[PDB]
Amino acid sequence: RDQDKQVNIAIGSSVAQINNYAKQIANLNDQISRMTGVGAGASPNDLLDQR
Amino acid sequence: DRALGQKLQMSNLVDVDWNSVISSYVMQQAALQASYKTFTDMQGM
Amino acid sequence: DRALGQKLQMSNLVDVDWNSVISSYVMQQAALQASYKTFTDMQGMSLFQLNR
Amino acid sequence: DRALGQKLQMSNLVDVDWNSVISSYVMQQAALQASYKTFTDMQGMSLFQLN
Amino acid sequence: TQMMYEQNMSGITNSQAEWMKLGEQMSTGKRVTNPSDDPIAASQAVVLS
Amino acid sequence: ISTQMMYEQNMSGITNSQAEWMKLGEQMSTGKRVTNPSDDPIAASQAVVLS
Amino acid sequence: RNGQALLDLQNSNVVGGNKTFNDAYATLVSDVGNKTSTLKTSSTTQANVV
């Protein structure tokens, strides 16, 4: 039973982090578009790799 | 024996592997030296 | 016999297992040595930040 | 044993932690070397004030 | 000219900060300290404690 | 600044490790799990009553 | 026996009623962890942008 006590709360804590991932990438991708077009020849190579 | 199992399972989470960290430590020291030489040259311009 | 039993009782309160403490201080001595190195290394390196 | 207790009690007033002192020693040693360097370079710049 | 100085200097800074962290863990001997060292497993550490 | 910080840190960690080693040395030399009221007082009191 | 009963309080779910005291500490820890991680990374990314 105690093994399950660990497992359940651990996954429950897990899920929120992926929502954090999603919103972070949402805003990041919001910016990469501008930095690509406004780059107009430049490229945020770090924003390429980091995402 | 239950306590022994718990004791080692804790190490699994908290502890640090000496070898990996010392290797990374030396490597990053080398990287530091590289960066410093880079700086002093570039400032030499 | 009643004295013997209490004599055995006494030790568990106050005596020490020898193997645990020995192995312990050995390993902590090794860790102590390693951190000692790290101090010496880090300060000598910090010297290069300005050895220039 | 009471004399030993005195001895340790003495230490608290007069004994020096070798690690603290040596750390401070190398720290101020670095300061001493660096400070020399700054004087030298500044004085060279002064020499160039006239040139 | 600024950009170049900042580029290389901040290179030095992040290289140091990396080494600082490796230095932290090595000197202490603990791989994990805090939400920044372990936002996840430290909770199970509490449980097992 | 952070040079200072990290050397100090090393100092903190090394001192804590040494303090552990020194308490180990205490019990080591004495061959006793306990000698003081501030080790674990209850054991001490039980020792007096058992004596 | 009342002394024996007190100890069981620690085994009770009451405060964490969906949980116990243990899990209050641990879940608060997990919360600060998620916050620390996500905010740190957002800060780093926006610093890169600027």
Q: How many other CB atoms are there within 10 angstroms of residue B35's CB atom? A: 18
Nearest to C13 among F17, F31, F46 (CB): F46
* Residue G26, token pair as written in the block: 């641990």
- For the CA atoms of C26, B5, E41, B26, the dihedral, rounded to the nearest 10 degrees, stands at 30
* Residue C29, token pair as written in the block: 């001595």
Q: In 3-state terms, what secondary structure has residue D38?
A: helix
Q: Do chains B and E touch (3 or more CB pairs under 8 A)?
A: yes
Q: Give me the resolution in angstroms, 1 decimal.
A: 2.9
Alpha-carbon G3 to chain mean position: 29
Shortest CA gap A5–chain E (Å):
10
Amino acid, res. A2: D
Is C37 in CB contact (< 8 Å) with chain B? no
Q: In 3-state terms, what secondary structure has residue A42?
A: strand
Exposed / middle / buried, residue A30 (Cβ in 10 Å: 0-12, 13-18, 19+)? exposed
Is E46 in CB contact (< 8 Å) with chain G? yes
Residue-by-residue DSSP string for E3-47: HHHHHHHHHHHHHHHHHHHHHHHHHH-BS--STTT-TTHHHHHHH
* CA–CA gap between residue F40 and residue G33 (Å, rounded): 35
CA atoms in the 13 A half-sphere facing the CB of C42: 30
> Which CA distances in Å does E29 have to A6, B21, F14, G48?
26, 10, 10, 32
Shortest CA gap E24–chain B (Å):
10
Radius of gyration of chain E (CA): 16
Task: Strands of chain C (E only): list them.
Answer: none
* Residue D42, token pair as written in the block: 């500044």
Q: Which DSSP symbol is given to A40?
A: B
CA atoms in the 13 A half-sphere facing the CB of A25: 10
Q: Give the method of determination.
A: cryo-EM
For chain C, the first-to-last Cα distance in angstroms comes to 79
* CA–CA gap between residue C6 and residue B43 (Å, rounded): 79
Q: How many other CB atoms are there within 10 angstroms of residue G18's CB atom? A: 7
Name the residue among B35, A11, E34, B20 with its Cα closest to residue G40: E34
Position of tokens 């880079």? B38
Cβ contact B25–E41 (<8 Å)? no
* Residue E49, token pair as written in the block: 């404690």
Residue-by-residue DSSP string for C1-52: -HHHHHHHHHHHHHB--HHHHHHHHHHHHHHHHHHHHHHHHHHHHHHHTT--
Interface mutation target, options E12, E26, E31, chain C, most CBs of C under 10 Å: E26
Secondary structure of chain F as H, E, C letters = CHHHHHHHHHHHHHHHHHHHHHHHHHHHHHCECCCCCCCCHHHHHHHHHHC
Name the residue among G13, D30, D36 with its Cα closest to residue A5: G13
Q: Residue F31 — left, alpha, or beta (φ > 0 → left; ψ -120 to 50 → alpha)?
A: left
φ/ψ of residue D8, rounded to 5:
-60, -40
Task: Strands of A1-51 (E only): list them.
Answer: none
Alpha-carbon D22 to chain mean position: 8
* CA–CA gap between residue B12 and residue A9 (Å, rounded): 19
Cβ contact E47–G29 (<8 Å)? no
* CA–CA gap between residue A31 and residue A51 (Å, rounded): 12
Q: At what angle do helices G21-49 and E41-48 cross, to 10 degrees?
A: 160
* Residue B28, token pair as written in the block: 């990053």
* CA–CA gap between residue E11 and residue C19 (Å, rounded): 49
Position of tokens 């080398």? B30
| Nearest-by-CA chain C residue for E23 | C38
D23 Cβ partners below 8 Å, 6+ apart? C39, C43, F7, F8, F11
Name the residue among G33, B28, E16 with its Cα closest to residue A13: G33
Radius of gyration of chain A (CA): 18
* Residue F2, token pair as written in the block: 């952070």
Name the residue among A10, E23, C22, E22 with its Cα closest to residue B13: A10
